[PDB]
């Protein structure tokens, strides 16, 4: 399938994110995140991932990234709580968080994925649509030192299976 | 048959709930097409090459609200705006704390618009950067003290933008 027919540059064009891969092989970022290695994906039910996200507070200091038109927006602090009101899922931070709305509903997939860049490893959430579009990601947060909580990564492979 | 300055006038009359994206999908343009049809008092058109100044102008002013919209999801940032140096590609924002951290194209930003449009009933301010294609990349509202009010300063400071922008 895909996974394998291009599994010629991962790692082997090392520094190569799904989204970018996504143009040379012109299929969804979510296509590559199907063809990813096993080792690396954990690809979940898209359906209420508001659990999902519920149980993101718990975890301490992350970093929410969403790009719109290649404008990238990264803000770094703890994922905010929240409720169900008016159809969607929305606020619950209190400072320094995020607000405000989220339509999961439009969320199809979700996949917990785990991708070494430049010499170092990266674990984040990746929330799709049946699109197959990005909507947008969660990567772990990172201490004082440049990288992660080491309690957070465990969470992270615990995940696979499932818990 | 009316002009789309006049359906949209007609629209902010009717329904003034809605938001320039809902209609948008109303009456099928881009969401520029109603910003720029938007009541001439109502919005200053800047072009995008003077985005990165207007951007660097913003520490300064304070608390605001940088809201963007994927997916049917929207997210929104309250704190002050990052200062910003252009690096490589983008122009990169070192954000400090609560303060939102990114890397913005604003070469693919073609304008900048000053939107004095109420929201939800109330007087509200916001930036909106569009692409060539028309869509809204993100907007930058103005912020809001503890007890639900604008700021004096920021609202002082971007009338006075749009006055310029207006020539």
């Given at each position: 399938s895909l996974?394998q027919?291009?599994?010629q540059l991962?790692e082997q064009?090392?520094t190569?994110?799904?989204?970018?891969?996504?143009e040379?092989l012109?299929?969804?970022?979510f296509?590559?995140?199907h063809?990813?290695?096993?080792?690396?994906?954990?690809?979940?039910?898209?359906?209420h991932?508001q659990?999902i996200?519920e149980?993101?507070?718990e975890?301490?200091?992350?970093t929410?990234?969403?790009?719109?038109?290649g404008?990238?927006?990264?803000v770094?602090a703890?994922f905010?709580?929240?409720?169900?009101?008016?159809?969607y899922?929305?606020l619950?931070?209190?400072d320094?968080?995020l607000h405000?709305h989220?339509?999961?509903?439009?969320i199809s997939h979700?996949?917990l994925?785990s991708?070494?860049?430049?010499?170092?490893?990266?674990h984040y959430?990746?929330f799709?649509?049946a699109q197959?579009?990005?909507?947008?990601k969660?990567?772990?947060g990172r201490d004082?030192?440049?990288?992660?909580?080491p309690?957070?990564?465990?969470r992270?492979?615990?995940?696979?299976?499932?818990h």
């Open positions: 996974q027919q291009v599994a991962l064009q090392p190569l994110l799904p989204a970018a891969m996504a040379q012109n299929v969804t970022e296509d590559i995140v063809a990813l290695p096993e080792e690396m994906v954990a690809v979940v039910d898209g359906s991932a659990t996200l149980s993101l507070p975890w301490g200091p992350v929410t990234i969403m790009t719109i038109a404008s990238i927006f990264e770094k703890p905010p709580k929240g409720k169900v009101a008016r159809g899922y929305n619950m931070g209190r320094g968080e405000g989220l339509k999961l509903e439009n979700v996949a994925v991708k070494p860049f430049m010499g170092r490893e990266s959430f990746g799709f649509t197959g579009e990005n909507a947008f969660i990567y772990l004082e030192k440049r990288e992660l909580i309690e957070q990564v465990a992270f492979k615990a995940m696979q299976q499932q």
